[PDB]
Amino acid sequence: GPEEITADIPNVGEAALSKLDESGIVYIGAEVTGGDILVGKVTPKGETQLTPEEKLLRAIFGEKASDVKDSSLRVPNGVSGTVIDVQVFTRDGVEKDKRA
Amino acid sequence: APELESRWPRSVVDLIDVLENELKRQNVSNPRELARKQAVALSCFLGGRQFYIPCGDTILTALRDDLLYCQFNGRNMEELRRQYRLSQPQIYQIIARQRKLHTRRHQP
Amino acid sequence: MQHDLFEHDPAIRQLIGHIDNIPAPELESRWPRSVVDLIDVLENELKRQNVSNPRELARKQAVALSCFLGGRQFYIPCGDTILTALRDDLLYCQFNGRNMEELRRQYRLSQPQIYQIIARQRKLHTRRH
Amino acid sequence: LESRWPRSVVDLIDVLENELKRQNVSNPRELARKQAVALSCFLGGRQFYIPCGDTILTALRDDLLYCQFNGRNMEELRRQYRLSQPQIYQIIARQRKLHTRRHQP
Amino acid sequence: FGIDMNTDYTLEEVGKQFDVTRERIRQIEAKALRKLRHPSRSEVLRSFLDD
Amino acid sequence: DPILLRPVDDLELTVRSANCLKAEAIHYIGDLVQRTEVELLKTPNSLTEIKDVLASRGLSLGMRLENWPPA
Amino acid sequence: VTEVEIDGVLHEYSTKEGVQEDILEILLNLKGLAVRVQGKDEVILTLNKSGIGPVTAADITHDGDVEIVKPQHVICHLTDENASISMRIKVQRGRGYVPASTRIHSEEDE
């Protein structure tokens, strides 16, 4: 499946998503420290083998992991700065996001 | 239609309000959001299972009972019997029980 | 105005406001086991919301829960339905009868479904009073 | 003084009388008075405790519910009565045999 | 769930061992699932939801 | 005195006397030990089981205590 | 001076029309502001200026409990008559030298 850029990311607190807009891109001028999410990227997740214990946990708690894998861009550790510019290039034919 | 509702989640909805009216009465911030997450715990806790919920005031007896022992002042045994529509045996029983209860409180 | 369930019957309401004068461990001793499993479960979410008096508050919800559904046969679903129900309720409230199109973008649901949602909560919002 | 007060006697007359007028019975006041005398003679000096908690009222509340029970209407009889199904199950089964002997002695 | 065994056994497979009752074994299963969901033994297990 | 501050609940007394004393809303021991025997006998139902327990606990009615209650 | 807010500016690595120097130069000029506060320990200062010519500390809207030692200390330069600059300056009181990491580490609000 095609990868999508979005602010909807599994098992991530809204605190880490506070610096992203509705399109999943960090605002210009946003101060960012090491480990934060500059752009939220979601990749479709293939079929995963479930061991007895984790499927017991799923049965206990009822949560289900959808076709999603977190591969978003993160600031490398120990680097702190401010985003001064973002540039988006998109292919011809595919629709442009509101940030673009 | 009733059989259609038999497995209907309508019961879930009915509950958020059940939580609302006490939370709103107790005046906590943001009724709706607190009560929905409050319900989700019950759903995961009680998903797909037979559950006996204590019915028909049984819990409310315990609270009716506590206030009555507080208002029992030693010679009004008639007064709180009218005002709760209870009877002499009931009054005596609750009295002795809560008396032992407080005696365990005052005594070590 | 105190307009809600405990408004109809203050007697139950005052009992809810009387549990403060009775500490927990003795009062739960007289209670049936099932509500004891409820209260700590209701407590469990509460400290996750960082709300004060987890023990005190959790009792207040448990008694009210027993107050209504005491005497009533209650069923519970589980799974995706719950947040579907949760989404339905927010849609009903957001629905001011003038922002149905706004909800059509907020929830993006088929037109007959929206009416079913709107109609269904309407029944749920009529039996209480 | 109430425990030794001859006030209850008169209280029995009107409670009787208001029922007799409801039942369209003639001379209800005089009829209730001699009934009060009848209670006084038998009950005089006897420690006589009577059931509380609507004991006759429920048993009658039991009866007409069994009349309305059609084998499918469990839920509406629940709402109309505020009684939970568990006890309704039991009472209906009891009333089942009760009216079973009523229909078939 | 096949814990510590080469394979898991379905409801039919476990029925032929203990009891052919379906709903009975299913409700014992649900009994265990609640008993695990109580916040007296679930405190440690709750830390594994993030994975 | 470590007993004047303790309430009436530390007597383990009879149910008749317990009912009689609380009809007048007594909460501490000190007000029992304050009143004398010539006024508490007007209450119906008591005169034969206070002196023994008071002597067993080392107390007696009729004595005078100032600054009471000390709050 | 510890915190500066300027309208229409997102970060310190941008520029504004009509201002001769850069935002970094503005902050470095602010760093050398000699301000005395009598009553309180935290003061919000407001600077508004519009026109052509140098901007000095005398253009700050003076407060009753704030003393400016150098009113001729230049702070910004404006080159366009229609150019206007509105700035909010926050001043606390302390001792020693405080880099920009300790304050953000200590304060947890967004």
From Swiss-Prot, chain A:
Highest taxon listed in the record's lineage: Bacteria
Post-translational modification: Acetylated on several lysine residues in the presence of glucose.
Biotechnology: Co-administration of salinamide and rifampicin or salinamide and myxopyronin suppresses the emergence of resistance to both antibiotics.
Family per record: Belongs to the RNA polymerase beta chain family.
Role, per record: DNA-dependent RNA polymerase (RNAP) catalyzes the transcription of DNA into RNA using the four ribonucleoside triphosphates as substrates.
Subunit structure: The RNAP catalytic core consists of 2 alpha, 1 beta, 1 beta' and 1 omega subunit. When a sigma factor is associated with the core the holoenzyme is formed, which can initiate transcription. The rRNA transcription and antitermination complex (rrnTAC) consists of RNAP, NusA, NusB, NusE (rpsJ), NusG, SubB, ribosomal protein S4, DNA and precursor rRNA; S4 is more flexible than other subunits. In pull-down experiments interacts with CedA.
Name recorded for this polypeptide: DNA-directed RNA polymerase subunit beta
Region of the whole protein represented: 846 to 945 of 1342
Curated annotation (Swiss-Prot), chain C:
Transmembrane segments: none
Induction: Expressed in the intermediate phase of the viral replicative cycle.
InterPro entries cross-referenced by the UniProt entry: c-mor_Regulatory_Protein (IPR052411), Homeodomain-like_sf (IPR009057), Mor_transcription_activator (IPR014875)
Keyword terms: Activator, DNA-binding, Host cytoplasm, Magnesium, Metal-binding, Transcription, Transcription regulation
Binding sites annotated in the UniProt record for Mg(2+): E26, D37, D40
Required cofactor(s): Mg(2+)
Domain free text: The helix-turn-helix (HTH) motif is involved in DNA-binding. The leucine zipper (bZIP) domain is involved in dimerization.
Family per record: Belongs to the c/mor transcriptional regulatory family.
Classification via PANTHER family: MU-LIKE PROPHAGE FLUMU PROTEIN C
Subunit structure: Homodimer.
Protein name according to UniProt: Late transcription activator C
Swiss-Prot record, chain E:
Subcellular location: Cytoplasm
Spans annotated as Interaction with anti-sigma factors: 22-37
Phenotype for R34 to D/E: 2-fold reduction in activation of class II Crp-dependent promoters
Region (Sigma-70 factor domain-4): 1-38
Purpose of the protein: Sigma factors are initiation factors that promote the attachment of RNA polymerase to specific initiation sites and are then released. This sigma factor is the primary sigma factor during exponential growth. Preferentially transcribes genes associated with fast growth, such as ribosomal operons, other protein-synthesis related genes, rRNA- and tRNA-encoding genes and prfB.
Family statement drawn from the similarity comment of this UniProt entry: Belongs to the sigma-70 factor family. RpoD/SigA subfamily.
Note on domains (UniProt): Contains 4 domains, connected by flexible linkers. In the active conformation, the domains are in an extended conformation, each making extensive interactions with the RNA polymerase catalytic core.
Quaternary assembly: Interacts transiently with the RNA polymerase catalytic core formed by RpoA, RpoB, RpoC and RpoZ (2 alpha, 1 beta, 1 beta' and 1 omega subunit) to form the RNA polymerase holoenzyme that can initiate transcription. Identified in a complex containing RpoD, the RNA polymerase subunits RpoA, RpoB and RpoZ, CRP and DNA. Interacts with Rsd; this prevents interaction with the RNA polymerase catalytic core and with promoter DNA, and as a consequence, promotes transcription from promoters that require alternative sigma factors.
Swiss-Prot record, chain F:
Entry's transmembrane regions: none
Residue span of region Alpha C-terminal domain (alpha-CTD): 1-71
Post-translational modification (record): (Microbial infection) ADP-ribosylated on both alpha subunits by the phage T4 protein ModA. ADP-ribosylated on only one of the alpha subunits by the phage T4 protein Alt.
Disulphide bridges, residue numbers: none
Record-listed ADP-ribosylarginine modification sites: R16
Quaternary structure note: Homodimer. The RNAP catalytic core consists of 2 alpha, 1 beta, 1 beta' and 1 omega subunit. When a sigma factor is associated with the core the holoenzyme is formed, which can initiate transcription. Both the N- and C-terminus interact with different regions of transcriptional regulator CRP. The rRNA transcription and antitermination complex (rrnTAC) consists of RNAP, NusA, NusB, NusE (rpsJ), NusG, SubB, ribosomal protein S4, DNA and precursor rRNA; S4 is more flexible than other subunits.
Job description of the protein: DNA-dependent RNA polymerase (RNAP) catalyzes the transcription of DNA into RNA using the four ribonucleoside triphosphates as substrates. This subunit plays an important role in subunit assembly since its dimerization is the first step in the sequential assembly of subunits to form the holoenzyme.
Free-text note on domains in this protein's UniProt record: The N-terminal domain is essential for RNAP assembly and basal transcription, whereas the C-terminal domain is involved in interaction with transcriptional regulators (such as CRP) and with upstream promoter elements.
Family statement: Belongs to the RNA polymerase alpha chain family.
